[PDB]
Amino acid sequence: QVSDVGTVIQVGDGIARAHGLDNVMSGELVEFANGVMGMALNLEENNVGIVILGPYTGIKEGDEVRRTGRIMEVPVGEALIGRVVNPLGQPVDGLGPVETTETRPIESPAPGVMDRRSVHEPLQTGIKAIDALVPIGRGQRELIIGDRQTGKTSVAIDTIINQKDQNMISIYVAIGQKESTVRTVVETLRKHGALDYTIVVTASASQPAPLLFLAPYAGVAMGEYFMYKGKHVLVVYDDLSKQAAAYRELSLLLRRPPGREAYPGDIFYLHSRLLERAAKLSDAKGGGSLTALPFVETQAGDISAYIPTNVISITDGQIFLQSDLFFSGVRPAINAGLSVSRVGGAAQIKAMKK
Amino acid sequence: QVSDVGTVIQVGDGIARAHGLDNVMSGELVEFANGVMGMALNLEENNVGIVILGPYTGIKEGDEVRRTGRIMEVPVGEALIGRVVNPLGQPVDGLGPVETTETRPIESPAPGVMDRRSVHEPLQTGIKAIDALVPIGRGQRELIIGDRQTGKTSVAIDTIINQKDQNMISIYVAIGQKESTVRTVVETLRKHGALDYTIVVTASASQPAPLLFLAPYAGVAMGEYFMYKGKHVLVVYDDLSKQAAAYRELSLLLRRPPGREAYPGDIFYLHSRLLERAAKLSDAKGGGSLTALPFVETQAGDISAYIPTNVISITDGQIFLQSDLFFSGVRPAINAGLSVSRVGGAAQIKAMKKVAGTLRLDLAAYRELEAFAQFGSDLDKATQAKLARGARTVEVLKQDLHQPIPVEKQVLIIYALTRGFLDDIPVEDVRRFEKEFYLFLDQNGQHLLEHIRTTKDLPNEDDLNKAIEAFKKTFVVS
Amino acid sequence: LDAKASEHAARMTAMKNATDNANELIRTLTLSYNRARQAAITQEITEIVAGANAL
Amino acid sequence: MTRGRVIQVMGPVVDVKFENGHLPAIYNALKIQHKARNENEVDIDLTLEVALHLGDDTVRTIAMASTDGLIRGMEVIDTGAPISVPVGEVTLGRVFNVLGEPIDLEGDIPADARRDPIHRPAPKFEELATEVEILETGIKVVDLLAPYIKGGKIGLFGGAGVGKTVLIQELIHNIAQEHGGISVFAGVGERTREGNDLYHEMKDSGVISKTAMVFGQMNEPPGARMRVALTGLTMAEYFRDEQGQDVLLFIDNIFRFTQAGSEVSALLGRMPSAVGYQPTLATEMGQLQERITSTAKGSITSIQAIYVPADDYTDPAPATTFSHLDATTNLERKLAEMGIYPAVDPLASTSRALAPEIVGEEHYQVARKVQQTLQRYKELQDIIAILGMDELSDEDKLVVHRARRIQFFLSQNFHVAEQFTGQPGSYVPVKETVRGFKEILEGKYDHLPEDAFRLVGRIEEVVEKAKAMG
Amino acid sequence: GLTMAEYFRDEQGQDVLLFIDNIFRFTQAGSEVSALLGRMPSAVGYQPTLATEMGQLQERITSTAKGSITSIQAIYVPADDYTDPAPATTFSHLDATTNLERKLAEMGIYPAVDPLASTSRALAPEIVGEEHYQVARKVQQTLQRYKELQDIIAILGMDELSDEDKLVVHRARRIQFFLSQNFHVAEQFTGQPGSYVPVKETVRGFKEILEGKYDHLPEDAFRLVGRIEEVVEKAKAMGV
Amino acid sequence: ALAPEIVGEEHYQVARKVQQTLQRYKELQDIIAILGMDELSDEDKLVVHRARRIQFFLSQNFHVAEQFTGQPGSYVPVKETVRGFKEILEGKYDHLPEDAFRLVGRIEEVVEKAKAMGV
Numbered sequence A: 001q002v003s004d005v006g007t008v009i010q011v012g013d014g015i016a017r018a019h020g021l022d023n024v025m026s027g028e029l030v031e032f033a034n035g036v037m038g039m040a041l042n043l044e045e046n047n048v049g050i051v052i053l054g055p056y057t058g059i060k061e062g063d064e065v066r067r068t069g070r071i072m073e074v075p076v077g078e079a080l081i082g083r084v085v086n087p088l089g090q091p092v093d094g095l096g097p098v099e100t101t102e103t104r105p106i107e108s109p110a111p112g113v114m115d116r117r118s119v120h121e122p123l124q125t126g127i128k129a130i131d132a133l134v135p136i137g138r139g140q141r142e143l144i145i146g147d148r149q150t151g152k153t154s155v156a157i158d159t160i161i162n163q164k165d166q167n168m169i170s171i172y173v174a175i176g177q178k179e180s181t182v183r184t185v186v187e188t189l190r191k192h193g194a195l196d197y198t199i200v201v202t203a204s205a206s207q208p209a210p211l212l213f214l215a216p217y218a219g220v221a222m223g224e225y226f227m228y229k230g231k232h233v234l235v236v237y238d239d240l241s242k243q244a245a246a247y248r249e250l251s252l253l254l255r256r257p258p259g260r261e262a263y264p265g266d267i268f269y270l271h272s273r274l275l276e277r278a279a280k281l282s283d284a285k286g287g288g289s290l291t292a293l294p295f296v297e298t299q300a301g302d303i304s305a306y307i308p309t310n311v312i313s314i315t316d317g318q319i320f321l322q323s324d325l326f327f328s329g330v331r332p333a334i335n336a337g338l339s340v341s342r343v344g345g346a347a348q349i350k351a352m353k354k
Numbered sequence B: 001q002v003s004d005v006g007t008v009i010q011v012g013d014g015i016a017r018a019h020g021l022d023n024v025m026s027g028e029l030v031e032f033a034n035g036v037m038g039m040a041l042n043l044e045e046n047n048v049g050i051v052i053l054g055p056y057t058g059i060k061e062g063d064e065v066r067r068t069g070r071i072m073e074v075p076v077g078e079a080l081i082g083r084v085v086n087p088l089g090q091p092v093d094g095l096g097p098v099e100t101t102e103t104r105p106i107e108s109p110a111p112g113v114m115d116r117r118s119v120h121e122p123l124q125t126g127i128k129a130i131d132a133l134v135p136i137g138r139g140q141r142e143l144i145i146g147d148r149q150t151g152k153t154s155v156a157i158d159t160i161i162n163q164k165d166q167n168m169i170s171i172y173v174a175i176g177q178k179e180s181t182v183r184t185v186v187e188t189l190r191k192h193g194a195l196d197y198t199i200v201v202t203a204s205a206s207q208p209a210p211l212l213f214l215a216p217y218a219g220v221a222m223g224e225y226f227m228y229k230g231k232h233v234l235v236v237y238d239d240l241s242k243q244a245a246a247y248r249e250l251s252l253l254l255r256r257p258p259g260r261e262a263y264p265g266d267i268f269y270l271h272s273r274l275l276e277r278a279a280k281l282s283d284a285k286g287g288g289s290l291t292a293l294p295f296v297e298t299q300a301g302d303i304s305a306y307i308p309t310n311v312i313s314i315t316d317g318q319i320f321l322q323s324d325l326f327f328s329g330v331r332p333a334i335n336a337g338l339s340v341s342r343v344g345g346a347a348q349i350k351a352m353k354k355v356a357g358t359l360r361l362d363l364a365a366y367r368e369l370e371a372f373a374q375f376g377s378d379l380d381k382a383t384q385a386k387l388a389r390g391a392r393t394v395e396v397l398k399q400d401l402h403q404p405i406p407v408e409k410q411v412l413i414i415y416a417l418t419r420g421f422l423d424d425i426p427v428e429d430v431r432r433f434e435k436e437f438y439l440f441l442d443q444n445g446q447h448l449l450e451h452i453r454t455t456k457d458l459p460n461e462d463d464l465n466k467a468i469e470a471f472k473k474t475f476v477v478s
Numbered sequence C: 001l002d003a004k005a006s007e008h009a010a011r012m013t014a015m016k017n018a019t020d021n022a023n024e025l026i027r028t029l030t031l032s033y034n035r036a037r038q039a040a041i042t043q044e045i046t047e048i049v050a051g052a053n054a055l
Numbered sequence D: 001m002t003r004g005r006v007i008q009v010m011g012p013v014v015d016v017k018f019e020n021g022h023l024p025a026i027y028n029a030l031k032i033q034h035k036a037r038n039e040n041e042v043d044i045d046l047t048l049e050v051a052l053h054l055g056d057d058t059v060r061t062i063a064m065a066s067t068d069g070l071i072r073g074m075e076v077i078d079t080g081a082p083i084s085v086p087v088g089e090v091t092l093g094r095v096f097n098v099l100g101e102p103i104d105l106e107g108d109i110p111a112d113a114r115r116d117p118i119h120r121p122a123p124k125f126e127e128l129a130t131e132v133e134i135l136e137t138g139i140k141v142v143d144l145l146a147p148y149i150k151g152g153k154i155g156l157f158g159g160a161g162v163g164k165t166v167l168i169q170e171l172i173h174n175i176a177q178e179h180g181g182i183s184v185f186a187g188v189g190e191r192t193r194e195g196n197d198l199y200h201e202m203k204d205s206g207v208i209s210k211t212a213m214v215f216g217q218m219n220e221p222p223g224a225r226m227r228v229a230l231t232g233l234t235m236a237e238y239f240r241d242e243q244g245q246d247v248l249l250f251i252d253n254i255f256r257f258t259q260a261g262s263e264v265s266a267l268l269g270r271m272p273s274a275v276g277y278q279p280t281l282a283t284e285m286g287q288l289q290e291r292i293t294s295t296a297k298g299s300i301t302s303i304q305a306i307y308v309p310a311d312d313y314t315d316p317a318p319a320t321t322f323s324h325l326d327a328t329t330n331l332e333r334k335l336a337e338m339g340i341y342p343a344v345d346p347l348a349s350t351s352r353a354l355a356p357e358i359v360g361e362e363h364y365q366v367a368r369k370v371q372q373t374l375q376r377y378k379e380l381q382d383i384i385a386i387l388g389m390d391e392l393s394d395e396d397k398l399v400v401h402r403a404r405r406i407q408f409f410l411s412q413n414f415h416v417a418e419q420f421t422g423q424p425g426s427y428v429p430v431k432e433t434v435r436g437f438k439e440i441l442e443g444k445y446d447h448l449p450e451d452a453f454r455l456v457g458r459i460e461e462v463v464e465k466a467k468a469m470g
Numbered sequence E: 001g002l003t004m005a006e007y008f009r010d011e012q013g014q015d016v017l018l019f020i021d022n023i024f025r026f027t028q029a030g031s032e033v034s035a036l037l038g039r040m041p042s043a044v045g046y047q048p049t050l051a052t053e054m055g056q057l058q059e060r061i062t063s064t065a066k067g068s069i070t071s072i073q074a075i076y077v078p079a080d081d082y083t084d085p086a087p088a089t090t091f092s093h094l095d096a097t098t099n100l101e102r103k104l105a106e107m108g109i110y111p112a113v114d115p116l117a118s119t120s121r122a123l124a125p126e127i128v129g130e131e132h133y134q135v136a137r138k139v140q141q142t143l144q145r146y147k148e149l150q151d152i153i154a155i156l157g158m159d160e161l162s163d164e165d166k167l168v169v170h171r172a173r174r175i176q177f178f179l180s181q182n183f184h185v186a187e188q189f190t191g192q193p194g195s196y197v198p199v200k201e202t203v204r205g206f207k208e209i210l211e212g213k214y215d216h217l218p219e220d221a222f223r224l225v226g227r228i229e230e231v232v233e234k235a236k237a238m239g240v
Numbered sequence F: 001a002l003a004p005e006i007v008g009e010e011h012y013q014v015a016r017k018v019q020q021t022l023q024r025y026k027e028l029q030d031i032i033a034i035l036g037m038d039e040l041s042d043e044d045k046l047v048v049h050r051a052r053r054i055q056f057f058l059s060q061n062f063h064v065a066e067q068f069t070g071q072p073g074s075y076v077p078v079k080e081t082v083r084g085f086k087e088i089l090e091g092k093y094d095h096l097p098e099d100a101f102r103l104v105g106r107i108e109e110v111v112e113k114a115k116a117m118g119v
């Protein structure tokens, strides 16, 4: 019987090959003998390539692989608000299981051309510099770009805190961060009361590369539930740079030919198909919205690099934080010369425009 | 049918692959049918990868290869003194057999961290700049790094010649050089009389790549015999970059995965193995020591290249030689600013240590303010004195080819320079003053020289001062 | 006397401004040099590996 | 039936074939013990670590020592677990290799002792601490201008002749004396001569009895040089988790750890990333660093010495390393020559903890004012050298006068320097150093001679020294 | 060609002049066949056996007791990059080295030999003579010193210089132009027949220039002259 | 299409003169960066003076830029463009500040600007 059961033939660096699984479907979830999940990536003529979503040291050649019959998906619902979970929806805060009822696929098509609407509602971040010079609207994709230790996380936390009175569900996705810093961020949010409307998705640097790869998609899939129920969602991706690094690691482990800066060819598609799912829906679709604030870390303020240019080509404007200005006492060191909001201004109240 | 013989399947570019040989050891030495020898590096599932240590044009597919049962080793003994041999221990000078009665394996463990002792004895090279600013101690390993035609070979030859009166055995290893160049070096050593305590190991550019790869290990194996029997040994590797290139050629021919600049993964491990065997043994293991002077040739002064980076990270210090400094009249060409030694002070005698700090400060003050040479040519209270002292320091540090200087004279000349006795002498007369002072010293200040030699400390200040003014009275300023 | 004092002060100020401009240019050129060096190393190793695995 | 068999040897890489269904897990340790059967063989004592499962019951391993003398077909046994090293008080005062075997001549640890696996997951989210806490070191300059965080990583920059080892010994002594926590030293890519010298230095200083020392020597294979940091980390983790102590972990050089990982990846044949580094550079760095954290019962504070290739701070290895650091200490040769033996640069040193939210408003203000005064004094050096001291304005005179006091007060007399000086060491609390620097900034001690501030502790010792001078 | 030369070296004991054209092409062809032979690539696309092949070719060109072969070899440097593996490897086998510079070529100086990069182990006091060694070292030092002054002059003009470096540069220009020569084969290019200069007269002329015997002559009179009388003749023909 | 028989002799000559001035300005950039305009000759300073104004006059306010900034766009005929650049090259407007040439249409708009501010 090799229809729903397989056998491992190779294991290495988080990648496994399995014999059998004749009826497996591309993108399905598979389960190993010890409980670790995997994703069916390549369906070859006589073997299946599986990406291991967890610790791979317990998987040995000859172990059994079992089908699940489900495309890559994560649990969603309102029971997930106020919890810290991994990109698979498993809680890590220790407060018990999450009682969700339905799920959404990790890979989902973006809203079409005729399903969208122009951005016309302001998103008040509470930061005077942003709200005055670089306004952000609901449904906009705005990039926060700067060097390390420039205050991007502080800006994101301030924006999330300010959303208390507005009807706005916030999702904070931390990719490749330190667990201690994530703990501190969660405690700050708890002190300020943000866990009444916030979901935290975490995948730290000690985690394997596939989880860092899959975290932003889990976050956006979680947000899309409320977006399509007619609500407004704010999603923050903390290091698209680290997501790209993890994807590069995975692609090189798969022996794919690299390009500029050893990145794969589809490094642009990786971020584009993620950031295209944030949109402002039309009245026919329900008027929901999703706002994305991806972060990009530059080296010595170089925004002409590959990943910074790729992300700039996708979003609707960027807020640039200046490293040397950050040392001048102006902690929200926004470089107004290199910062712009393309779909801003229209999404700004009458008084502030005047 | 047996597991002690095999048949050759593939031949080409100096390597062969053989079927069988089921009981061959990794790194073992094997013999072909026609009498040439080989060393087994790759042991695959069905075949053995063999590098050939000789002319491979006589090897064809299908002939037999046999086990020898011994890991590669080289002959050792006192009979090798004064001979020129290849990395296999076979003489190439044509003076007959060597007659050694003992062997030592090519690869041997380095001394443990508890078998060693702190470096505390000076290695006098006879070069004033090195002895004063970049000290080298017995048991230290010091890198000599620079571009082509900068003087590294001359520095090594002077260092070897200076060891005549000491109690050290010298080993010179030449990797990838012309046989004519090696013969010229041997002739220079014979002329200066250093060939009665020196051993020469040769791997010319026409030799197979494995011989170039194996030469430094043969050298250290020969040195370790004397080191472990209680003596002091000095070993020089003439081009570790050529040794690394030969190893890269072998690895690429054996189809091992390449890395940066197509080098194999264990290229750093190779040089770490080589250079970690130089040590200063503790009194429990005997007072023996081995000191190494590896050479690395940089391209256009780029010390950020892969092999130079590895060797710099491995060694205990660097000596940089620069082409512009070489052609500006500074023939020793040692860049005293970039060069560094991590055994400084411990590798110097007290007399040299008492003046080396002032010399270093005076040279450091003059290396900056070089832009101020043209500007402020008028009188200035401080910078003029600094420039005048620095010019004389640079003139003092110059030295001629194959003219080592005793440390008791180096100390005296540096004392005379630093204490201000050279200030009233023109820059053009400094070298003549030094030569005539050396001639005056062995004529009159024999008591000072003997005091320095016996106590390793500076003589009495007033007597030294009287000697210096007595010579200055005789000296004629031109 | 005022003319000579003004001339020397002007020379001092102009020279320090020139030195500052030169230092800034050196910093930017060093950044560009490091980027080019990294790109060259990456391209060389990628070409070597592609040639090696093309066999 | 648990036996393996050597099937393929290529330098430091060995492939072993096992019986079907009995393959060892990844990162397991395999041992080879062979006695020479005849004159054509040599004795083998080698340890391997599992890296990949190649299929067809074959496993690819990395050797921890030299593979010379191996023969295709000799027996390999599986230990059933990763590398295990002894833990506890038996490790204090001892020197180990990567395998956990003692290197000094003080005998071997009995087999009855407890041993812990080298590879383990990082502590979970709910086991971590929630509040940031300052680690008081007792050194004035460190406590003032670059505070340390319990569970944080501190980068250490410098070279030879700046007293890095002296500072390390003083940190060990102070932490053990005033907190009761042990320290661990990990010599990744250590030169044997410098390791021997450091061991003798620690024995002379007396801090050897409260430290565990681990050496991965430079002549060891890349696998050993890669794994030595993890055995040091395990030895620290035992005391962190079982005794509830606050432990220091010293890593001799982390760039050597990254380059050993790169060499191992190249040997395994993976396609290079970045400039030449391994594809898993960030993953390996994160797996090493994320185990050095503060928990509900203890913490590990780690000081890394960091080498920057080609002085390029944007190089991938320094870039990955800096993403985990919380502070930075730079040692200055100019200060060493001037006579400041702590040698910590007061302006180049930075710390994430220097923020009023956690360190205190008064501490923040004092630190900012001290840094401003030092910068002002630094700006005047060229004009002072050219024109002279008397040509300055009155405010410049006062700034120089106070800054030359501050520069001297930043120094301290160390306990470990007593064997050379004769003066006992000092431990200065953060409150005491803050108050002293505040008093100096206020001008309370402008009439005192400047040499009185040279090598004293609290703000009263300078008064006593000045009175002794007269 | 080497096989044809070795017969005359060994079997007849002659002195052989082996003129070999671009060595770089031999290595280039070796690298061209390397990939099709099935071998892995190397650092800059060359074959792995570059140094071994180069040495096996070069070590056969040597002087022995039977006879002597002297070889003059032209070596191409790709894109003026002297760090290229083939020219970098070729240096180990040479006794004398002559470097040609595009900077000197464009300025109008031929043969455009670099006076500082060129080296030879025959330049020793016991080989060529103490006077020759002194003159050569003084010329090299003067040229190196003049090269330094150009950086200052490019910003501050000639007038800012003192009156000893003024003489230094004024004589260095003369030396640099006197290092030129008109070749017999350059007659097709210039219309001027070439000249042959013995080494004794070369040394004498350079020593006289260094001592300033012809300091009053115009600078341009030293270009493509040959002997030291010919620059005086040119100066006479063009005025001074 | 930039050929004298397609665009006209004066159009071609004006374009070539503008390009020549801009090329000279680009060549002067490194000296200007290192040590400013103080060491430039009289003709080089005039070249810089003309080139900065030409570069600023090459800017324009677009109709689609109404959404970013409130300034309405402008449509400029090629005859007006050629005449304006010819007038700038002839030196008619060397006395106007260079900020008056930014984001305008015809040269009449440049003249109207610097009247709302100091002339």
Ligand SMILES: Nc1ncnc2c1ncn2[C@@H]1O[C@H](COP(=O)(O)OP(=O)(O)OP(=O)(O)O)[C@@H](O)[C@H]1O
Binding pocket: A147, A148, A149, A150, A151, A152, A153, A154, A155, A331, A332, D352, D355
């Ligand atoms: N407005 C502000 N006022 C005061 N301090 C601030 C402000 N914004 C940021 N900081 C501080 O400056 C530092 C910047 O850290 P932060 O995490 O916000 O930046 P980052 O760029 O996301 O950092 P990293 O690269 O470590 O992830 C922190 O110490 C933070 O407390």
Ligand SMILES: Nc1ncnc2c1ncn2[C@@H]1O[C@H](COP(=O)(O)OP(=O)(O)OP(=O)(O)O)[C@@H](O)[C@H]1O
Binding pocket: B147, B148, B149, B150, B151, B152, B153, B154, B155, B331, B332, B399, B400, B401, E120, E121
């Ligand atoms: N101190 C010195 N004084 C005078 N001449 C020197 C001195 N040192 C070296 N030379 C000369 O400079 C040249 C340098 O040759 P040397 O063999 O020493 O250099 P190298 O660094 O080994 O270079 P290579 O073998 O690549 O040419 C030789 O002609 C040598 O005679």
Ligand SMILES: [Mg+2]
Binding pocket: A152, A153, A154
């Ligand atoms: Mg952050």
Ligand SMILES: [Mg+2]
Binding pocket: B152, B153
């Ligand atoms: Mg040489």
